[PDB]
Amino acid sequence: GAMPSKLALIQELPDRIQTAVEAAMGMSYQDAPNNVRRDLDNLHACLNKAKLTVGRMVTSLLEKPSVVAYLEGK
Amino acid sequence: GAMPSKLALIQELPDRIQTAVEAAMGMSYQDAPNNVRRDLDNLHACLNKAKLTVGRMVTSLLEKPSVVAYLEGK
Numbered sequence: 840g841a842m843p844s845k846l847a848l849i850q851e852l853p854d855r856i857q858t859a860v861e862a863a864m865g866m867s868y869q870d871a872p873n874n875v876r877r878d879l880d881n882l883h884a885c886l887n888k889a890k891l892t893v894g895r896m897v898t899s900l901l902e903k904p905s906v907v908a909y910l911e912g913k
Numbered sequence: 914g915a916m917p918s919k920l921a922l923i924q925e926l927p928d929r930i931q932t933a934v935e936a937a938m939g940m941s942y943q944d945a946p947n948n949v950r951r952d953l954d955n956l957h958a959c960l961n962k963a964k965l966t967v968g969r970m971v972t973s974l975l976e977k978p979s980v981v982a983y984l985e986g987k
Contacts, residue, residue, distance in 0.1 A: 845937075845940045845941070845942065845944075848936040848937050848940055849937060849940075849956070851936070852933060852934060852936070852937055852960070855932065855933035855934070855936070856930060856933040856934075856963075858929070858933070859926060859929035859930045859932070859933040859967075860926060860929070860930075860967075862917075862922040862925070862926070862929070863919075863922050863923060863926055866919045866922055867919075868919065868983070870983075871983040872979070872983075874979075875977075875979045875980045875983055876983070878973070878974055878977065878980045879919075879974070879980075881970075881973070882923070882970060882974060885970050886926070886967060886970055889930075889963060889966055889967050889970065892959075892963060892966075893933075893934075893960065893963050896956065896959050896960060896963065897956075899952075899955070900952055900953070900956055903949075903952065905946075905949045906945075906949045906952045906953075909942070909944065909945040909949055909950075
Protein backbone atom coordinates (compact mmCIF):
# COMPACT_ATOMS: atom_id res chain seq x y z
CA GLY A 840 0.00 0.00 0.00
CA ALA A 841 2.20 2.77 -1.31
CA MET A 842 0.33 6.06 -1.34
CA PRO A 843 2.25 8.23 -3.87
CA SER A 844 4.73 10.60 -2.27
CA LYS A 845 5.16 14.19 -3.51
CA LEU A 846 8.22 12.96 -5.45
CA ALA A 847 6.01 10.42 -7.18
CA LEU A 848 4.03 13.47 -8.30
CA ILE A 849 6.98 15.71 -9.23
CA GLN A 850 8.60 12.84 -11.17
CA GLU A 851 5.35 11.86 -12.92
CA LEU A 852 4.65 15.47 -13.96
CA PRO A 853 6.90 14.89 -17.06
CA ASP A 854 4.86 11.80 -17.99
CA ARG A 855 1.58 13.58 -17.24
CA ILE A 856 2.64 16.42 -19.53
CA GLN A 857 3.87 13.89 -22.07
CA THR A 858 0.33 12.54 -21.92
CA ALA A 859 -1.00 16.10 -21.81
CA VAL A 860 0.34 16.80 -25.26
CA GLU A 861 0.78 13.33 -26.82
CA ALA A 862 -2.59 13.97 -28.43
CA ALA A 863 -1.34 17.12 -30.14
CA MET A 864 2.05 15.59 -30.94
CA GLY A 865 0.37 12.61 -32.57
CA MET A 866 -2.05 15.01 -34.26
CA SER A 867 -2.05 14.77 -38.03
CA TYR A 868 -1.92 18.39 -39.14
CA GLN A 869 -0.49 17.45 -42.54
CA ASP A 870 -4.06 17.51 -43.88
CA ALA A 871 -3.88 21.25 -43.36
CA PRO A 872 -2.07 23.94 -45.42
CA ASN A 873 1.58 24.32 -44.45
CA ASN A 874 1.23 27.69 -42.72
CA VAL A 875 -1.69 26.76 -40.45
CA ARG A 876 -0.30 23.33 -39.76
CA ARG A 877 2.98 25.14 -39.08
CA ASP A 878 1.03 26.81 -36.35
CA LEU A 879 0.65 23.22 -35.15
CA ASP A 880 4.36 22.90 -36.02
CA ASN A 881 4.89 25.73 -33.53
CA LEU A 882 2.66 23.79 -31.17
CA HIS A 883 5.05 20.94 -31.89
CA ALA A 884 8.17 22.89 -31.09
CA CYS A 885 6.89 25.07 -28.28
CA LEU A 886 4.52 22.65 -26.52
CA ASN A 887 7.06 19.88 -26.74
CA LYS A 888 9.50 22.53 -25.48
CA ALA A 889 6.90 23.06 -22.75
CA LYS A 890 7.40 19.45 -21.73
CA LEU A 891 11.11 20.14 -21.98
CA THR A 892 10.90 23.11 -19.61
CA VAL A 893 8.74 21.17 -17.17
CA GLY A 894 10.88 18.08 -17.26
CA ARG A 895 13.90 20.19 -16.43
CA MET A 896 11.97 22.27 -13.92
CA VAL A 897 11.58 18.96 -12.12
CA THR A 898 15.30 18.54 -12.75
CA SER A 899 15.84 21.91 -11.04
CA LEU A 900 14.11 20.47 -7.96
CA LEU A 901 16.11 17.27 -8.45
CA GLU A 902 19.50 19.02 -8.37
CA LYS A 903 19.35 19.56 -4.60
CA PRO A 904 19.24 16.79 -1.97
CA SER A 905 17.08 18.54 0.64
CA VAL A 906 14.37 19.33 -1.91
CA VAL A 907 14.55 15.81 -3.36
CA ALA A 908 14.39 14.14 0.06
CA TYR A 909 11.28 16.09 1.07
CA LEU A 910 9.49 15.02 -2.10
CA GLU A 911 10.21 11.33 -1.50
CA GLY A 912 9.84 11.78 2.20
CA LYS A 913 13.32 10.77 3.21
CA GLY B 914 -21.01 10.39 -28.96
CA ALA B 915 -18.28 12.74 -30.13
CA MET B 916 -15.06 11.40 -31.60
CA PRO B 917 -12.31 13.88 -30.62
CA SER B 918 -10.88 15.99 -33.42
CA LYS B 919 -7.64 17.99 -33.35
CA LEU B 920 -9.54 20.94 -31.83
CA ALA B 921 -10.95 18.74 -29.10
CA LEU B 922 -7.30 17.95 -28.42
CA ILE B 923 -5.98 21.54 -28.59
CA GLN B 924 -8.84 22.71 -26.35
CA GLU B 925 -8.37 19.89 -23.82
CA LEU B 926 -4.57 20.37 -23.77
CA PRO B 927 -5.03 23.17 -21.13
CA ASP B 928 -7.14 20.88 -18.94
CA ARG B 929 -4.77 17.97 -19.51
CA ILE B 930 -1.89 20.15 -18.34
CA GLN B 931 -4.02 21.55 -15.55
CA THR B 932 -4.26 17.90 -14.61
CA ALA B 933 -0.60 17.22 -15.39
CA VAL B 934 0.19 19.82 -12.79
CA GLU B 935 -2.81 19.72 -10.37
CA ALA B 936 -1.03 17.02 -8.40
CA ALA B 937 1.95 19.30 -7.79
CA MET B 938 -0.26 22.31 -7.09
CA GLY B 939 -2.24 20.36 -4.50
CA MET B 940 1.03 19.03 -3.12
CA SER B 941 1.50 19.76 0.58
CA TYR B 942 5.00 21.17 0.29
CA GLN B 943 4.48 23.14 3.52
CA ASP B 944 5.59 19.90 5.16
CA ALA B 945 9.01 21.19 4.15
CA PRO B 946 11.00 24.24 5.42
CA ASN B 947 10.37 27.59 3.79
CA ASN B 948 13.38 27.58 1.46
CA VAL B 949 13.01 24.03 0.13
CA ARG B 950 9.24 24.38 -0.09
CA ARG B 951 9.98 27.70 -1.80
CA ASP B 952 11.78 25.51 -4.27
CA LEU B 953 8.29 24.04 -4.63
CA ASP B 954 7.07 27.66 -4.63
CA ASN B 955 9.18 28.07 -7.76
CA LEU B 956 7.69 24.78 -8.92
CA HIS B 957 4.33 26.41 -8.27
CA ALA B 958 5.03 29.67 -10.01
CA CYS B 959 6.85 28.08 -12.94
CA LEU B 960 4.51 25.05 -13.37
CA ASN B 961 1.40 27.10 -12.93
CA LYS B 962 3.17 29.40 -15.41
CA ALA B 963 3.98 26.29 -17.48
CA LYS B 964 0.32 25.40 -17.69
CA LEU B 965 -0.39 28.93 -18.76
CA THR B 966 2.41 29.14 -21.33
CA VAL B 967 0.57 26.24 -22.85
CA GLY B 968 -2.57 28.21 -22.08
CA ARG B 969 -1.33 30.94 -24.37
CA MET B 970 0.11 28.51 -26.88
CA VAL B 971 -3.37 27.09 -27.32
CA THR B 972 -4.67 30.66 -27.34
CA SER B 973 -2.13 31.40 -30.09
CA LEU B 974 -3.69 28.72 -32.29
CA LEU B 975 -7.13 29.82 -31.14
CA GLU B 976 -6.75 33.42 -32.32
CA LYS B 977 -6.73 32.58 -36.03
CA PRO B 978 -9.66 31.15 -38.00
CA SER B 979 -7.77 28.98 -40.50
CA VAL B 980 -5.88 27.24 -37.69
CA VAL B 981 -8.99 26.83 -35.54
CA ALA B 982 -11.15 25.55 -38.41
CA TYR B 983 -8.67 22.82 -39.32
CA LEU B 984 -8.56 21.66 -35.72
CA GLU B 985 -12.36 21.32 -35.57
CA GLY B 986 -12.62 20.18 -39.13
CA LYS B 987 -14.51 23.07 -40.65
